[PDB]
């Protein structure tokens, strides 16, 4: 037990498409201190009550985190058609989960990155004269193929990248374009917590 949430608040946060996943199993958690530590702009839970998930035993508790600007709030919603959901990150509704959008009070051990970023487009080109142009869409709870290049950020808005695909991947030429937004006064973060729990296997319990 005694699972640590320290890596969530240690080091430079990652980008939206390069989200890091932490899985908790057979441990005691304190969600109240984490929520109280950050100034919660929005707290929503689907399929479970906010207090029930705070004081409820579970089997597996998985949290994925990323850096997300506060202005672009409307794009991360259960129903949306923006570039965030199509290529960068799509939420999964297989199990009940909670979405938390908060800001760091800047008094902690967090290093502000250069700027936010996300992918405008990501597609594949093939055919007789390179004219087929099949777009690629990310499945929920997965990774984007365009993430291999530009792991940390973009130097300037409108960067264009090209790479040659292999036979196993599918063939053709992959092309992608990214965007950039200026940094706000204080760090802004987004947290997604989802649980896959069984009645007889509730190893994880609140502390």
């Amino acid at each position: 037990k005694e699972c640590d949430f320290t890596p969530m608040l240690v080091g430079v946060p990652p980008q939206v498409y390069n989200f890091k996943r932490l899985v908790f199993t057979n441990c005691n958690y304190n969600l109240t201190k984490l929520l109280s530590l950050f100034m919660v702009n929005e707290f929503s839970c689907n399929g479970i009550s906010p207090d029930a998930i705070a004081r409820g035993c579970y089997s597996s508790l998985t949290v994925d985190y990323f850096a997300y600007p506060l202005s672009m709030r409307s794009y991360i919603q259960p129903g949306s058609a923006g570039d965030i959901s199509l290529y960068n990150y799509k939420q999964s509704f297989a199990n009940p989960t909670c979405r938390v959008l908060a800001t760091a009070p800047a008094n902690l051990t967090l290093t502000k990155p250069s700027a936010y970023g996300y992918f405008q487009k990501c597609s594949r080109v093939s055919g007789e004269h390179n004219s087929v142009e099949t777009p690629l869409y990310i499945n929920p709870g997965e990774y984007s193929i365009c993430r291999s290049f530009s792991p940390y950020g973009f130097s300037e808005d409108g960067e264009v990248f090209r790479r040659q695909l292999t036979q196993y991947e599918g063939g053709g030429i992959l092309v992608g374009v990214g965007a950039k937004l200026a940094m706000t006064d204080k760090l802004e973060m987004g947290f997604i917590i989802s649980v896959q729990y069984g009645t007889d296997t509730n190893s994880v319990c609140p502390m």
Partner: protein, 725 residues
């Protein structure tokens, strides 16, 4: 005897052609300038009124170069302090005069050294470019708003084009496009960070002690080209507290894998735009249609709404892909496209389907589309009598495509076989302009029933003057080579007799998609030679000439300097056998590309020609710009067409110049065809030991258009021709 056309008449402009220039401002009114006064005419009756008197002009205190009037008719824009930069570029100062309350606005003035200014299609908005940045004024008396902040000299351009785009792609200096009702504004941006520079010297008057060096970003064949971006902005949400927001539209994925250009921008409706893209290898093009989303504020471009244009025999388009003509609802459009037989006609597209449907067919080409109405469509072609040099106006019914009517065929069968049109706002009235075999004629017509209203100009004054002056005649005919017809023209001296013998001079351009045999009336240097010196001047259109089919136009693909050169030589042999040409006196001269062909003809060693003149020639295709050269030749690399780059130079034929006489003329400050090209020809000829003549002009551009230099160059060439004959 009677007098003849002389060289002094051509140089001093003794005989003048009168014009009638008008600007449509409504569906039934236009503007005209008489004695420095602006007048308003009604097309229905011919009434006249005074819009602005010349006393107001003199009160300003400056010389006014040009004027512009807002669509609502409340403000007028004045321009002064004109300084020219390139063919389509300049810099000037501006002021705004209010017509309703009759005074000059003195608050929030447009800055000096402004690069481009334009009105909105509806209302009285303004947008101008200064220091490579875009500004917008909602009202003339209010402060401006700033849209771009990245402009920097010779690197970043916002709202204006660089050298290569201005000369070869857009043929304009502007890069701002307004929405149909003024809500949006679209612009393009270029960097030239990695493009090399060309340097030449400027001397600038006697008082200057050290010459100046001019550096211009100029991409040559195989070098690095600029990059382009596209943005759209909303002018109804501008505010002083916050900076503006611009939304970018990205090129399709089939274009991002390599180099590409932007070649056309057009608005379909209030919330729809269309863009065209072209690859660096100019035989593949894509057209995109993009819409506006109110929920997100972005612009969405759909894959199912893309159209592809390809060519297997050559390049796409005549010089560039053509422009669409959308209907009112924006769900369909018309365009000019080559068919299966190689002739250009009109498709009818649906924005969701891939296929065309051709509404015209035959062994002739459609030149352009003029106006579109809910019932009829208007265009210009050369179908009449099978003459590629003619132009006429036609009308086609959209319900049934079998009904085609000609509107200018039988207006006056003689004196007029070349036409142009200018329509009103709603296509209710139009003006026909004739530059046919006879003197120019201007007429006004209606569209409801196609009846001629009145005659605007007939050049009756010039007819009386020319009645007592001997003038040449013109002949247009054809010859047959390999079961194919080729057209030529001849300027003939007065009192022409077939028994006698005359010297012959051949005027050559022979560029791709060019025409030198037509029915246009001109007064130029060729008129002098025939009238006074009794010389026949002829022009010939061979392989590579346009307006006849893709079979003839595309014959010179990836082979420049091979077929068009031999065609000119064979034409001279055919002319010699007619009977009225002296074999011992034949000459040739040309301009720009014509200088390149003239030099190659002289160095062939045929022995048909005696003397020749080349002015501002092209020497090697690696010294010329990338967009023009790579369209017909490709890249200069061992894997793609490098052998023919080396075999098509003028400097490899220097030994054959010992049999002819040669004259070389070039301008020092030429920015289009640099002085380097003529410098290399001189060095090669000196190395082999050939005697020739040369002449340089200081601080002169490609055109050599200054009054003093214009008279000097044509006097010098006249002496050379007379001595040769």
């Amino acid at each position: 005897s009677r007098k003849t056309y002389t060289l002094t008449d051509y140089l001093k402009n003794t005989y003048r052609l009168k014009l009638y220039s008008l600007r449509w401002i409504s569906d039934h009114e236009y503007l005209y300038k008489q004695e420095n006064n602006i007048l308003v005419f009604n097309a229905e009756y011919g009434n006249s009124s005074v819009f602005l008197e010349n006393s107001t002009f003199d009160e300003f205190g400056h010389s006014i170069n040009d004027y512009s009037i807002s669509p609502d008719g409340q403000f007028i824009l004045l321009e002064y302090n004109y300084v020219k930069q390139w063919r389509h570029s300049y810099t000037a100062s501006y002021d705004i005069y209010d017509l309703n309350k009759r005074q000059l606005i003195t608050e929030e003035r447009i800055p000096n050294n402004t690069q481009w200014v334009t009105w909105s299609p509806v209302g009285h908005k303004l947008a101008y470019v200064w220091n490579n940045d875009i500004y917008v004024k909602i009202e003339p008396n209010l402060p401006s708003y700033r849209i771009t902040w990245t402009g920097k000299e010779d690197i970043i351009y916002n709202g204006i084009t660089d050298w290569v785009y201005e000369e070869e792609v857009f043929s304009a200096y502007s890069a701002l496009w307004w929405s149909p009702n003024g809500t949006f504004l679209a612009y393009a941006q270029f960097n030239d960070t990695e493009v090399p520079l060309i340097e030449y010297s400027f001397y600038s008057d006697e008082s200057l002690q050290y010459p100046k060096t001019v550096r211009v970003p100029y991409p040559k064949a195989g070098a690095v080209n600029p990059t382009v971006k596209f943005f759209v902005v909303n002018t109804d949400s501008l505010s002083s507290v916050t900076n503006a927001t611009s939304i970018q539209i990205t090129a399709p994925a089939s274009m991002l894998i390599g180099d590409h250009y932007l070649c056309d921008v057009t608005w379909a409706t209030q919330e729809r735009i269309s863009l065209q893209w072209l690859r660096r290898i100019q035989n593949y093009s894509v057209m995109d249609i993009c819409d506006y989303d109110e929920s997100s504020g972005r612009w969405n471009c759909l894959v199912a709404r893309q159209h592809i244009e390809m060519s297997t025999t050559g390049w796409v388009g005549r010089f560039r892909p053509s422009e669409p003509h959308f209907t009112l609802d924006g769900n369909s459009f018309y365009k000019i496209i080559s068919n299966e037989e190689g002739y250009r006609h009109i498709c009818y597209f649906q924005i969701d389907k891939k296929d065309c449907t051709f509404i015209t067919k035959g062994t002739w080409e459609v030149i352009g589309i003029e106006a579109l109405t809910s019932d009829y469509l208007y265009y210009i072609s050369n179908e009449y009598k099978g003459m590629p040099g003619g132009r006429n106006l036609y009308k086609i019914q959209l319900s049934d495509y079998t009904k085609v009517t000609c509107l200018s065929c039988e207006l006056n069968p003689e004196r007029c076989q070349y036409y142009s049109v200018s329509f009103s706002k709603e296509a209710k009235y139009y003006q026909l302009r004739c530059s046919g075999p006879g003197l120019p004629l201007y007429t006004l017509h209606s569209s409801v029933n196609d009846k001629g209203l009145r005659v605007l100009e007939d050049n009756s004054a010039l007819d009386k003057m020319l009645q007592n002056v001997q003038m040449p005649s013109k002949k247009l005919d054809f010859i047959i080579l390999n079961e194919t017809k080729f057209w030529y023209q001849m300027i003939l001296p007065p009192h022409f007799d077939k028994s006698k013998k005359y010297p012959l001079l051949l005027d050559v351009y022979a560029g791709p998609c060019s025409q030198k045999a037509d029915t246009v009336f001109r007064l130029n240097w060729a008129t002098y030679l025939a009238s006074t010196e009794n010389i026949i001047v002829a022009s010939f259109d061979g392989r590579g000439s346009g307006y006849q089919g893709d079979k003839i136009m595309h014959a010179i693909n990836r082979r420049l300097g091979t077929f068009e050169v031999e065609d000119q030589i064979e034409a001279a042999r055919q002319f010699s056998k007619m009977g009225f040409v002296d074999n011992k006196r034949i000459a040739i001269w040309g301009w720009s590309y014509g200088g390149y062909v003239t030099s190659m003809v002289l160095g062939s060693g045929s022995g048909v020609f005696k003397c020749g003149i080349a002015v501002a020639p092209v020497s090697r295709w690696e010294y010329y710009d990338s967009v023009y050269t790579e369209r017909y030749m490709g890249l200069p690399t061992p894997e793609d067409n490098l052998d023919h780059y080396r075999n098509s130079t003028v400097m490899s034929r220097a030994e054959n110049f010992k049999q002819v006489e040669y004259l070389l003329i070039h301008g020092t400050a030429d920015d289009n065809v640099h002085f380097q090209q003529s410098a290399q020809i001189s060095k090669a000829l000196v190395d082999v030991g050939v005697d020739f003549q040369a002449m340089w002009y200081t601080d002169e551009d490609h055109g050599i258009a200054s009054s003093t230099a214009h008279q000097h160059i044509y006097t010098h060439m006249s002496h050379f021709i007379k001595q040769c004959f």
